[PDB]
Design a protein around this ligand. Structure first.
Ligand SMILES: Cc1cccnc1CN1CCC2(CC1)C(=O)N(c1ccc(-c3ccccc3)cc1)C(=O)N2c1ncccn1
Ligand SMILES: [Mn+2]
Length: 198
């Protein structure tokens, strides 16, 4: 599906109906492999915050710009949100050391973030061997979903209490990149609570 059709015919209806949406083969093999190389070159869990213009991060920047265009093509149809910006990218290297993340909500208290977008980099990742599954518990539903951290897979989900999630421990190093998109009204309300530079 082309980006306009992908947004309007798949991401929008899927987010509105389920609050979670998986796009496989988002950028293609060549672009995905370049992003994987850049992330491995960056120098317990290791988190680095990336704007996209740093040396050796050009293809990470391309991923970010591509996620931005896809969101733009949703034409304000994602929930009631007016999306006008996003965070930097959280580039994460998770060692396979048998630690996980307890069930949590990314934005439980109105900090501005409305959509979590995760891009995965793990080729031939077997969850039954290496672990690292993301388990999402959509609010009020009888079912939950385990998401495999597949190479070139883009995951969207609402960042608020609709999607508590936990991360299973892993036995091989996992790499993922996350951005969060802001709702204009929520982000404006968050900014009345303090002063510049604080
Ligand atoms: C690790 C993981 C894997 C899969 C799914 N979820 C998670 C965890 N969640 C995802 C990552 C998590 C915790 C929740 C998270 O949202 N923000 C975060 C917090 C605040 C803003 C912000 C930015 C601008 C304005 C307002 C707010 C942006 C991001 C972290 O800094 N985070 C984090 N996480 C681990 C180590 C350090 N920091
Ligand atoms: Mn999370």
């Amino acid at each position: 599906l082309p980006a306009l059709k992908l947004a309007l015919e798949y991401i929008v209806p899927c987010m509105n109906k389920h609050g979670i949406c998986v796009v496989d083969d988002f950028l293609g093999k060549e672009t995905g492999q370049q992003i994987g190389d850049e992330v491995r070159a960056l120098h317990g869990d290791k988190i680095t915050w990336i704007e996209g213009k740093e040396p050796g991060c050009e293809t990470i920047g391309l991923l970010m710009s591509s996620m931005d265009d896809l969101i733009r093509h949703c034409n304000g149809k994602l929930g009631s949100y007016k999306i006008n910006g996003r965070t930097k990218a959280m580039v994460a290297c998770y060692p396979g050391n048998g630690t996980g993340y307890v069930r949590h909500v990314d934005n439980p208290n109105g900090d501005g973030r409305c959509v979590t977008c995760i891009y995965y980099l793990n080729k031939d990742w077997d969850a039954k061997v290496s672990g690292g599954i993301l388990r999402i518990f959509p609010e009020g539903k009888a079912q939950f979903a385990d998401i495999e951290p597949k190479f070139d897979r883009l995951l969207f989900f609402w960042s608020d209490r609709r999607n508590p999630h936990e991360v299973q421990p892993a036995y091989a190093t996992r790499y993922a990149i996350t951005v969060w998109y802001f709702d204009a009204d929520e982000r404006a309300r968050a900014k009345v609570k303090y002063l510049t530079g604080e």
